[PDB]
Amino acid sequence: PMFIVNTNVPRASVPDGFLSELTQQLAQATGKPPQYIAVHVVPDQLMAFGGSSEPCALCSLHSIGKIGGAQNRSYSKLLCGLLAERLRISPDRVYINYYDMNAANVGWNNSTFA
Amino acid sequence: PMFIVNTNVPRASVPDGFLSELTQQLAQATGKPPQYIAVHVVPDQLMAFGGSSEPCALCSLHSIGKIGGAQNRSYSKLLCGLLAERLRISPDRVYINYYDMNAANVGWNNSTFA
Amino acid sequence: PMFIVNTNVPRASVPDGFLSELTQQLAQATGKPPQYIAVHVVPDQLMAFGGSSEPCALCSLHSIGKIGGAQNRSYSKLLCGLLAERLRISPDRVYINYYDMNAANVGWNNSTFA
Numbered sequence: 468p469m470f471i472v473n474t475n476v477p478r479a480s481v482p483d484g485f486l487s488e489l490t491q492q493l494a495q496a497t498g499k500p501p502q503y504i505a506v507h508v509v510p511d512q513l514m515a516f517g518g519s520s521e522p523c524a525l526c527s528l529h530s531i532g533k534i535g536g537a538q539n540r541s542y543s544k545l546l547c548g549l550l551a552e553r554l555r556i557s558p559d560r561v562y563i564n565y566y567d568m569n570a571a572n573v574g575w576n577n578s579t580f581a
Numbered sequence: 582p583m584f585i586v587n588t589n590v591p592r593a594s595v596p597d598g599f600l601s602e603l604t605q606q607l608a609q610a611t612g613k614p615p616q617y618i619a620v621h622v623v624p625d626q627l628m629a630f631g632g633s634s635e636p637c638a639l640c641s642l643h644s645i646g647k648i649g650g651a652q653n654r655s656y657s658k659l660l661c662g663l664l665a666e667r668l669r670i671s672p673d674r675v676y677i678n679y680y681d682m683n684a685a686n687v688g689w690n691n692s693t694f695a
Numbered sequence: 696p697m698f699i700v701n702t703n704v705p706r707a708s709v710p711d712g713f714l715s716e717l718t719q720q721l722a723q724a725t726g727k728p729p730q731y732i733a734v735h736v737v738p739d740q741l742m743a744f745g746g747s748s749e750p751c752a753l754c755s756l757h758s759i760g761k762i763g764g765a766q767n768r769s770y771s772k773l774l775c776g777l778l779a780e781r782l783r784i785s786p787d788r789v790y791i792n793y794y795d796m797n798a799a800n801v802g803w804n805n806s807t808f809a
């Protein structure tokens with residue numbers, strides 16, 4: 468799985484250990500080994516949410532499977548909780564786009580997962 | 582709806598007010614209120630189009646519905662027009678990927694829109 | 696086609712010629728004219744892969760057609776090879792998401808490719 472957060476929160480406000488916390492929490496949430504979890508945080512972005520430049524985040528979670536109605540509700544609670552606690556971003560200023568990827572459409576290690 | 586633009590145009594060439602103009606015009610174009618619109622501009626990027634480093638842009642528009650052939654032609658005219666007028670990017674050096682998101686695959690405020 | 700690479704490798708470690716090589720090799724691999732190839736490299740990113748912040752890359756290839764099982768395996772060998780040779784990223788620390796875009800869902804030059 469791959470989780471990306473783009474945010475206008477400044478770099479210095481991203482706490483040490485945030486990438487490792489995201490890795491462990493997403494490994495637990497997706498049921499996949501941490502070795503497969505990729506995380507990417509992009510601070511200092513020029514972005515607005517609802518016309519406002521107060522703290523916000525635009526995010527995506529891609530996974531081969533483990534994506535669906537109830538699962539995505541759970542991921543949204545988990546990830547909004549982490550963004551609120553660690554980055555001080557209100558959950559109503561976060562969007563997360565979820566992508567269920569087919570194995571043939573994910574390259575890795577000179578091939579794909581197909 | 583969520584609109585992202587990545588461009589090699591420098592930050593100082595992004596005019597004041599641009600995020601608000603994008604918010605307003607996308608609200609009108611999609612039929613969703615400004616409150617739902619997120620916009621994200623990423624200047625100073627290392628990118629080429631057709632092998633050339635002349636000004637260019639790679640963009641995304643994500644929406645739950647309101648995506649389709651005629652609508653996407655209209656969005657492209659609107660958004661290429663804005664990028665040409667405000668960022669001086671030729672419309673033939675812009676790509677915009679459109680994504681019709683399922684409500685269950687969009688998270689916000691601790692849940693999803695399903 | 697459009698290829699994006701996000702990496703924690705620093706900007707100074709991206710060699711001169713990288714975007715040009717990606718453009719030429721992707722034109723060759725996809726069979727599309729280089730005039731239609733867009734490339735984008737984003738170094739200096741805060742990211743981790745599998746619990747490690749050693750060099751890694753999260754990438755996307757979007758194309759109208761030219762996407763499929765065998766084609767994506769070939770692209771992954773080509774692109775992981777380039778990332779290893781030029782950026783010193785191990786191929787097992789690379790993810791590439793492939794997207795077969797409908798022509799009506801790609802804006803360009805004030806319209807779509809439909």
Ligand SMILES: CN(Cc1cnc2[nH+]c(N)nc(N)c2n1)c1ccc(C(=O)N[C@@H](CCC(=O)O)C(=O)O)cc1
Pocket residue numbers: 517582613616617618645689694
């Ligand atoms: C971002 N959204 C949530 C929201 C709801 N439905 C959607 N439905 C679709 N199809 N797409 C998106 N993006 C949607 N987003 C959003 C943002 C701000 C207010 C808002 O300012 N509400 C007023 C009025 C209260 C109310 O909405 O009941 C307020 O003062 O809080 C509502 C919704």
